[PDB]
Amino acid sequence: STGSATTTPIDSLDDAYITPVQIGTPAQTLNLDFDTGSSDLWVFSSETTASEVDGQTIYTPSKSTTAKLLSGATWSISYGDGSSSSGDVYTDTVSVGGLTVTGQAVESAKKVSSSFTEDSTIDGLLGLAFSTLNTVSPTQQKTFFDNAKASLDSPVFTADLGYHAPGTYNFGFIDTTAYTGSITYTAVSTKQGFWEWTSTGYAVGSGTFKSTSIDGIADTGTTLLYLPATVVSAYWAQVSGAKSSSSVGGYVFPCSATLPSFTFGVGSARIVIPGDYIDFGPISTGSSSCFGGIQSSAGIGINIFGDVALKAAFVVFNGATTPTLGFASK
Ligand SMILES: OCc1cnc(N2CCOCC2)s1
């Protein structure tokens, strides 16, 4: 089997991408944030505290003839940005782009933190990291991809995120028309539960490529590119008027600037992030200070190849017995 679903930016800045997901019988379609940095499939629901729902579409398990309470199971997650959610668990049928999994754990939110409430466009998350990170207790549950894997034509999914445009998540096949050149594959460590890999270096604009190992994670659920303060300082030094504000939350630049590209290495291959992908617009409405899309990871504990980096590439998440990552230009 295979699946192919379109993923759409939630706003004009590509802050996140939403993908329609059919849950239950008859289907209830919710728009979920596919997140290769986590491993829970959780949804706003009829059980979510009413004051914490503000425009999201909810899953109502009592209206699904295939829903079953997973007795005794609870979940609770905290994300790197400080947001969180928790609740109980049902199993139900879940389909993505025509690919159907029966008995998928659907984690129903009883509580969500304010950032989720305040974003009416995201109805939940669909985690695509390794199932060892799934938070369901006392019996850990499998991700949608782990459940689907054995049925797929090939044990892979691909992320093809658009710049200010829709893109595609495919399951079970590699669309050879979706990228240029070849796909370069690179080793993955699953020791932390992430799609963790090592970039071979970087360049700023037309500058020379610096060969240096940069360990990090491929994370579709993080908006920006978070890298070593050294690498990040080298990039912002090429933009006139750039400064790092503790008060705003990182590097900002004058909105009148033209940003240079940023290149990262994948083995001997190179992925070029155009300068325009690094512009996240005014810090507040009407400001002439703009927020940068490349930021320091120094306070995170890990480097994160988030959407800014991933949307410059066609990315293969190869879930074979020894997982690997693939990157191609497009
Ligand atoms: O081509 C693979 C597909 C993409 N979306 C599909 N559907 C199936 C019907 O329910 C809406 C979603 S099939």
Side-chain angles (χ1 to χ4, degrees), residues 1-62 64-67 69-109 112-141 143-148 150-190 192-242 244-330:
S1 63
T2 64
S4 187
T6 297
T7 193
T8 299
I10 64 166
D11 62 23
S12 63
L13 297 181
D14 300 344
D15 283 317
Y17 299 77
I18 49 172
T19 307
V21 177
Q22 280 72 43
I23 309 176
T25 308
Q28 299 178 41
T29 299
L30 275 66
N31 297 328
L32 304 188
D33 186 349
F34 281 25
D35 180 13
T36 63
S38 70
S39 306
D40 288 50
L41 192 176
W42 73 261
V43 296
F44 280 78
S45 76
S46 58
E47 301 180 330
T48 309
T49 299
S51 66
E52 294 176 355
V53 184
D54 185 9
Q56 296 81 10
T57 295
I58 64 166
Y59 170 60
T60 303
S62 68
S64 174
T65 59
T66 43
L69 178 73
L70 187 63
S71 179
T74 60
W75 62 281
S76 180
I77 193 161
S78 307
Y79 295 102
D81 64 358
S83 66
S84 62
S85 52
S86 62
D88 56 16
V89 187
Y90 295 81
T91 56
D92 209 340
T93 302
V94 174
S95 301
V96 176
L99 170 66
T100 300
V101 167
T102 58
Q104 175 63 46
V106 176
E107 300 172 35
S108 165
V112 304
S113 66
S114 61
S115 65
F116 289 114
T117 299
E118 291 162 4
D119 182 3
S120 64
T121 72
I122 290 175
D123 302 324
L125 266 66
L126 189 149
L128 294 166
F130 293 88
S131 292
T132 53
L133 298 181
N134 177 266
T135 77
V136 176
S137 179
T139 306
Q140 187 171 65
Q141 301 293 304
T143 70
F144 174 81
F145 178 56
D146 261 4
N147 280 324
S151 303
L152 294 177
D153 290 357
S154 181
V156 304
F157 68 91
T158 65
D160 181 7
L161 300 181
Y163 168 65
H164 296 175
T168 304
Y169 283 102
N170 292 328
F171 294 83
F173 72 106
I174 292 165
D175 178 359
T176 61
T177 74
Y179 59 85
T180 63
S182 53
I183 305 176
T184 297
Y185 291 86
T186 198
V188 164
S189 172
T190 65
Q192 296 192 83
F194 302 121
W195 292 90
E196 188 171 1
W197 66 289
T198 302
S199 172
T200 50
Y202 69 98
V204 176
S206 58
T208 62
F209 186 82
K210 175 73 167 179
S211 292
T212 184
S213 293
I214 304 169
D215 297 340
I217 65 169
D219 183 3
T220 58
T222 290
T223 312
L224 306 186
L225 174 53
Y226 296 87
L227 292 173
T230 48
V231 172
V232 179
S233 189
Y235 175 85
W236 289 109
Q238 299 304 312
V239 178
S240 304
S244 192
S245 174
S246 43
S247 53
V248 176
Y251 281 94
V252 292
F253 69 93
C255 297
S256 58
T258 301
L259 296 180
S261 61
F262 185 86
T263 301
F264 65 94
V266 183
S268 53
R270 307 287 181 254
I271 300 293
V272 181
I273 306 170
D276 286 357
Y277 290 27
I278 299 161
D279 188 344
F280 280 73
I283 51 168
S284 293
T285 301
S287 181
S288 72
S289 292
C290 276
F291 195 66
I294 297 177
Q295 296 294 345
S296 178
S297 64
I300 294 174
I302 198 159
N303 300 307
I304 306 173
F305 292 89
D307 296 336
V308 162
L310 301 182
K311 75 188 176 187
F314 178 87
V315 187
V316 181
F317 294 80
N318 167 30
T321 304
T322 298
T324 64
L325 281 167
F327 293 82
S329 294
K330 64 187 187 190

PDB file of all heavy atoms in Angstrom, residues 77-101:
ATOM      1  N   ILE A  77       2.400  14.968  27.343  1.00  0.00           N
ATOM      2  CA  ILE A  77       3.576  15.326  26.563  1.00  0.00           C
ATOM      3  C   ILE A  77       3.911  16.792  26.785  1.00  0.00           C
ATOM      4  O   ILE A  77       3.023  17.633  26.972  1.00  0.00           O
ATOM      5  CB  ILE A  77       3.354  14.986  25.071  1.00  0.00           C
ATOM      6  CG1 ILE A  77       4.669  15.054  24.296  1.00  0.00           C
ATOM      7  CG2 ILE A  77       2.315  15.913  24.477  1.00  0.00           C
ATOM      8  CD1 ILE A  77       4.634  14.322  22.970  1.00  0.00           C
ATOM      9  N   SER A  78       5.207  17.089  26.795  1.00  0.00           N
ATOM     10  CA  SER A  78       5.708  18.454  26.833  1.00  0.00           C
ATOM     11  C   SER A  78       6.678  18.612  25.680  1.00  0.00           C
ATOM     12  O   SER A  78       7.590  17.795  25.513  1.00  0.00           O
ATOM     13  CB  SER A  78       6.430  18.740  28.148  1.00  0.00           C
ATOM     14  OG  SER A  78       5.607  18.401  29.246  1.00  0.00           O
ATOM     15  N   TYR A  79       6.476  19.645  24.886  1.00  0.00           N
ATOM     16  CA  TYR A  79       7.282  19.866  23.700  1.00  0.00           C
ATOM     17  C   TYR A  79       8.407  20.855  23.985  1.00  0.00           C
ATOM     18  O   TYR A  79       8.401  21.576  24.990  1.00  0.00           O
ATOM     19  CB  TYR A  79       6.396  20.366  22.563  1.00  0.00           C
ATOM     20  CG  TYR A  79       5.374  19.340  22.117  1.00  0.00           C
ATOM     21  CD1 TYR A  79       4.040  19.418  22.516  1.00  0.00           C
ATOM     22  CD2 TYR A  79       5.750  18.278  21.299  1.00  0.00           C
ATOM     23  CE1 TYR A  79       3.104  18.469  22.096  1.00  0.00           C
ATOM     24  CE2 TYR A  79       4.832  17.328  20.877  1.00  0.00           C
ATOM     25  CZ  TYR A  79       3.512  17.426  21.274  1.00  0.00           C
ATOM     26  OH  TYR A  79       2.609  16.479  20.848  1.00  0.00           O
ATOM     27  N   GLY A  80       9.383  20.879  23.074  1.00  0.00           N
ATOM     28  CA  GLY A  80      10.555  21.717  23.260  1.00  0.00           C
ATOM     29  C   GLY A  80      10.239  23.195  23.378  1.00  0.00           C
ATOM     30  O   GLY A  80      11.014  23.952  23.971  1.00  0.00           O
ATOM     31  N   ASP A  81       9.118  23.635  22.804  1.00  0.00           N
ATOM     32  CA  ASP A  81       8.733  25.040  22.880  1.00  0.00           C
ATOM     33  C   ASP A  81       7.986  25.381  24.158  1.00  0.00           C
ATOM     34  O   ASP A  81       7.532  26.520  24.302  1.00  0.00           O
ATOM     35  CB  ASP A  81       7.889  25.446  21.664  1.00  0.00           C
ATOM     36  CG  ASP A  81       6.558  24.713  21.593  1.00  0.00           C
ATOM     37  OD1 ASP A  81       6.289  23.854  22.457  1.00  0.00           O
ATOM     38  OD2 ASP A  81       5.771  25.001  20.663  1.00  0.00           O
ATOM     39  N   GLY A  82       7.840  24.436  25.082  1.00  0.00           N
ATOM     40  CA  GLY A  82       7.155  24.696  26.327  1.00  0.00           C
ATOM     41  C   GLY A  82       5.674  24.391  26.319  1.00  0.00           C
ATOM     42  O   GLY A  82       5.036  24.501  27.375  1.00  0.00           O
ATOM     43  N   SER A  83       5.107  24.014  25.176  1.00  0.00           N
ATOM     44  CA  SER A  83       3.700  23.648  25.115  1.00  0.00           C
ATOM     45  C   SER A  83       3.509  22.214  25.611  1.00  0.00           C
ATOM     46  O   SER A  83       4.465  21.455  25.774  1.00  0.00           O
ATOM     47  CB  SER A  83       3.173  23.819  23.691  1.00  0.00           C
ATOM     48  OG  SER A  83       3.786  22.904  22.797  1.00  0.00           O
ATOM     49  N   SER A  84       2.254  21.843  25.856  1.00  0.00           N
ATOM     50  CA  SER A  84       1.963  20.538  26.440  1.00  0.00           C
ATOM     51  C   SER A  84       0.500  20.177  26.230  1.00  0.00           C
ATOM     52  O   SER A  84      -0.341  21.029  25.930  1.00  0.00           O
ATOM     53  CB  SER A  84       2.284  20.518  27.935  1.00  0.00           C
ATOM     54  OG  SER A  84       1.494  21.459  28.635  1.00  0.00           O
ATOM     55  N   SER A  85       0.212  18.888  26.397  1.00  0.00           N
ATOM     56  CA  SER A  85      -1.148  18.370  26.333  1.00  0.00           C
ATOM     57  C   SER A  85      -1.182  17.010  27.024  1.00  0.00           C
ATOM     58  O   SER A  85      -0.142  16.376  27.232  1.00  0.00           O
ATOM     59  CB  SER A  85      -1.627  18.289  24.883  1.00  0.00           C
ATOM     60  OG  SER A  85      -0.693  17.587  24.075  1.00  0.00           O
ATOM     61  N   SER A  86      -2.390  16.573  27.395  1.00  0.00           N
ATOM     62  CA  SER A  86      -2.548  15.289  28.071  1.00  0.00           C
ATOM     63  C   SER A  86      -3.988  14.805  27.953  1.00  0.00           C
ATOM     64  O   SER A  86      -4.903  15.582  27.691  1.00  0.00           O
ATOM     65  CB  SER A  86      -2.155  15.394  29.543  1.00  0.00           C
ATOM     66  OG  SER A  86      -2.989  16.312  30.237  1.00  0.00           O
ATOM     67  N   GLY A  87      -4.184  13.505  28.165  1.00  0.00           N
ATOM     68  CA  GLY A  87      -5.537  12.962  28.171  1.00  0.00           C
ATOM     69  C   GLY A  87      -5.563  11.451  28.237  1.00  0.00           C
ATOM     70  O   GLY A  87      -4.700  10.822  28.863  1.00  0.00           O
ATOM     71  N   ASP A  88      -6.595  10.879  27.616  1.00  0.00           N
ATOM     72  CA  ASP A  88      -6.791   9.430  27.586  1.00  0.00           C
ATOM     73  C   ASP A  88      -6.673   8.948  26.140  1.00  0.00           C
ATOM     74  O   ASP A  88      -6.291   9.710  25.252  1.00  0.00           O
ATOM     75  CB  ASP A  88      -8.065   9.007  28.331  1.00  0.00           C
ATOM     76  CG  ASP A  88      -9.310   9.673  27.824  1.00  0.00           C
ATOM     77  OD1 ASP A  88      -9.285  10.236  26.716  1.00  0.00           O
ATOM     78  OD2 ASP A  88     -10.331   9.617  28.549  1.00  0.00           O
ATOM     79  N   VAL A  89      -6.959   7.672  25.899  1.00  0.00           N
ATOM     80  CA  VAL A  89      -6.587   7.056  24.627  1.00  0.00           C
ATOM     81  C   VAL A  89      -7.715   6.180  24.118  1.00  0.00           C
ATOM     82  O   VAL A  89      -8.303   5.400  24.875  1.00  0.00           O
ATOM     83  CB  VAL A  89      -5.294   6.217  24.755  1.00  0.00           C
ATOM     84  CG1 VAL A  89      -4.824   5.728  23.380  1.00  0.00           C
ATOM     85  CG2 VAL A  89      -4.198   7.023  25.431  1.00  0.00           C
ATOM     86  N   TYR A  90      -7.979   6.284  22.823  1.00  0.00           N
ATOM     87  CA  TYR A  90      -8.851   5.374  22.100  1.00  0.00           C
ATOM     88  C   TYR A  90      -8.031   4.684  21.022  1.00  0.00           C
ATOM     89  O   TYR A  90      -6.990   5.190  20.591  1.00  0.00           O
ATOM     90  CB  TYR A  90     -10.024   6.149  21.464  1.00  0.00           C
ATOM     91  CG  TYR A  90     -10.920   6.742  22.512  1.00  0.00           C
ATOM     92  CD1 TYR A  90     -10.596   7.940  23.144  1.00  0.00           C
ATOM     93  CD2 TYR A  90     -12.066   6.077  22.915  1.00  0.00           C
ATOM     94  CE1 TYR A  90     -11.402   8.459  24.139  1.00  0.00           C
ATOM     95  CE2 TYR A  90     -12.877   6.588  23.898  1.00  0.00           C
ATOM     96  CZ  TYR A  90     -12.545   7.773  24.507  1.00  0.00           C
ATOM     97  OH  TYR A  90     -13.378   8.232  25.488  1.00  0.00           O
ATOM     98  N   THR A  91      -8.481   3.520  20.583  1.00  0.00           N
ATOM     99  CA  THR A  91      -8.020   3.001  19.305  1.00  0.00           C
ATOM    100  C   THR A  91      -9.115   3.231  18.274  1.00  0.00           C
ATOM    101  O   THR A  91     -10.303   3.152  18.593  1.00  0.00           O
ATOM    102  CB  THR A  91      -7.631   1.521  19.365  1.00  0.00           C
ATOM    103  OG1 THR A  91      -8.721   0.734  19.852  1.00  0.00           O
ATOM    104  CG2 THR A  91      -6.428   1.333  20.274  1.00  0.00           C
ATOM    105  N   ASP A  92      -8.716   3.524  17.040  1.00  0.00           N
ATOM    106  CA  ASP A  92      -9.682   3.752  15.972  1.00  0.00           C
ATOM    107  C   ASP A  92      -8.951   3.600  14.647  1.00  0.00           C
ATOM    108  O   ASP A  92      -7.721   3.487  14.590  1.00  0.00           O
ATOM    109  CB  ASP A  92     -10.324   5.132  16.126  1.00  0.00           C
ATOM    110  CG  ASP A  92     -11.731   5.200  15.580  1.00  0.00           C
ATOM    111  OD1 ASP A  92     -12.097   4.335  14.764  1.00  0.00           O
ATOM    112  OD2 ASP A  92     -12.478   6.125  15.974  1.00  0.00           O
ATOM    113  N   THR A  93      -9.729   3.613  13.578  1.00  0.00           N
ATOM    114  CA  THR A  93      -9.189   3.597  12.229  1.00  0.00           C
ATOM    115  C   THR A  93      -8.743   4.993  11.832  1.00  0.00           C
ATOM    116  O   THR A  93      -9.491   5.965  11.989  1.00  0.00           O
ATOM    117  CB  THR A  93     -10.254   3.084  11.272  1.00  0.00           C
ATOM    118  OG1 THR A  93     -10.639   1.786  11.722  1.00  0.00           O
ATOM    119  CG2 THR A  93      -9.718   3.000   9.857  1.00  0.00           C
ATOM    120  N   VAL A  94      -7.516   5.084  11.319  1.00  0.00           N
ATOM    121  CA  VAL A  94      -6.905   6.342  10.911  1.00  0.00           C
ATOM    122  C   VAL A  94      -6.394   6.184   9.487  1.00  0.00           C
ATOM    123  O   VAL A  94      -5.669   5.226   9.187  1.00  0.00           O
ATOM    124  CB  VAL A  94      -5.762   6.736  11.860  1.00  0.00           C
ATOM    125  CG1 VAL A  94      -5.031   7.964  11.349  1.00  0.00           C
ATOM    126  CG2 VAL A  94      -6.310   6.964  13.256  1.00  0.00           C
ATOM    127  N   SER A  95      -6.767   7.119   8.611  1.00  0.00           N
ATOM    128  CA  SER A  95      -6.302   7.118   7.233  1.00  0.00           C
ATOM    129  C   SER A  95      -5.642   8.442   6.875  1.00  0.00           C
ATOM    130  O   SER A  95      -6.127   9.517   7.251  1.00  0.00           O
ATOM    131  CB  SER A  95      -7.429   6.841   6.266  1.00  0.00           C
ATOM    132  OG  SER A  95      -8.033   5.596   6.545  1.00  0.00           O
ATOM    133  N   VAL A  96      -4.536   8.352   6.143  1.00  0.00           N
ATOM    134  CA  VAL A  96      -3.785   9.505   5.657  1.00  0.00           C
ATOM    135  C   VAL A  96      -3.585   9.305   4.166  1.00  0.00           C
ATOM    136  O   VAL A  96      -2.902   8.364   3.752  1.00  0.00           O
ATOM    137  CB  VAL A  96      -2.419   9.645   6.346  1.00  0.00           C
ATOM    138  CG1 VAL A  96      -1.642  10.814   5.738  1.00  0.00           C
ATOM    139  CG2 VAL A  96      -2.581   9.799   7.842  1.00  0.00           C
ATOM    140  N   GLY A  97      -4.131  10.197   3.364  1.00  0.00           N
ATOM    141  CA  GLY A  97      -3.911  10.176   1.914  1.00  0.00           C
ATOM    142  C   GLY A  97      -4.240   8.831   1.315  1.00  0.00           C
ATOM    143  O   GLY A  97      -3.415   8.311   0.607  1.00  0.00           O
ATOM    144  N   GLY A  98      -5.289   8.152   1.805  1.00  0.00           N
ATOM    145  CA  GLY A  98      -5.710   6.843   1.267  1.00  0.00           C
ATOM    146  C   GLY A  98      -5.047   5.646   1.906  1.00  0.00           C
ATOM    147  O   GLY A  98      -5.395   4.571   1.475  1.00  0.00           O
ATOM    148  N   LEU A  99      -4.094   5.822   2.812  1.00  0.00           N
ATOM    149  CA  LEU A  99      -3.442   4.737   3.541  1.00  0.00           C
ATOM    150  C   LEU A  99      -4.139   4.574   4.885  1.00  0.00           C
ATOM    151  O   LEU A  99      -4.201   5.524   5.662  1.00  0.00           O
ATOM    152  CB  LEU A  99      -1.982   5.103   3.781  1.00  0.00           C
ATOM    153  CG  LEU A  99      -1.208   4.198   4.736  1.00  0.00           C
ATOM    154  CD1 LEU A  99      -1.048   2.788   4.183  1.00  0.00           C
ATOM    155  CD2 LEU A  99       0.142   4.838   5.025  1.00  0.00           C
ATOM    156  N   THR A 100      -4.651   3.377   5.165  1.00  0.00           N
ATOM    157  CA  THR A 100      -5.484   3.129   6.338  1.00  0.00           C
ATOM    158  C   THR A 100      -4.778   2.217   7.334  1.00  0.00           C
ATOM    159  O   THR A 100      -4.258   1.154   6.961  1.00  0.00           O
ATOM    160  CB  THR A 100      -6.818   2.503   5.925  1.00  0.00           C
ATOM    161  OG1 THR A 100      -7.502   3.405   5.054  1.00  0.00           O
ATOM    162  CG2 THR A 100      -7.674   2.198   7.136  1.00  0.00           C
ATOM    163  N   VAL A 101      -4.790   2.620   8.604  1.00  0.00           N
ATOM    164  CA  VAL A 101      -4.339   1.799   9.724  1.00  0.00           C
ATOM    165  C   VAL A 101      -5.529   1.539  10.634  1.00  0.00           C
ATOM    166  O   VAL A 101      -6.210   2.481  11.046  1.00  0.00           O
ATOM    167  CB  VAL A 101      -3.221   2.521  10.503  1.00  0.00           C
ATOM    168  CG1 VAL A 101      -2.975   1.840  11.847  1.00  0.00           C
ATOM    169  CG2 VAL A 101      -1.943   2.580   9.671  1.00  0.00           C
TER     170      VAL A 101
END
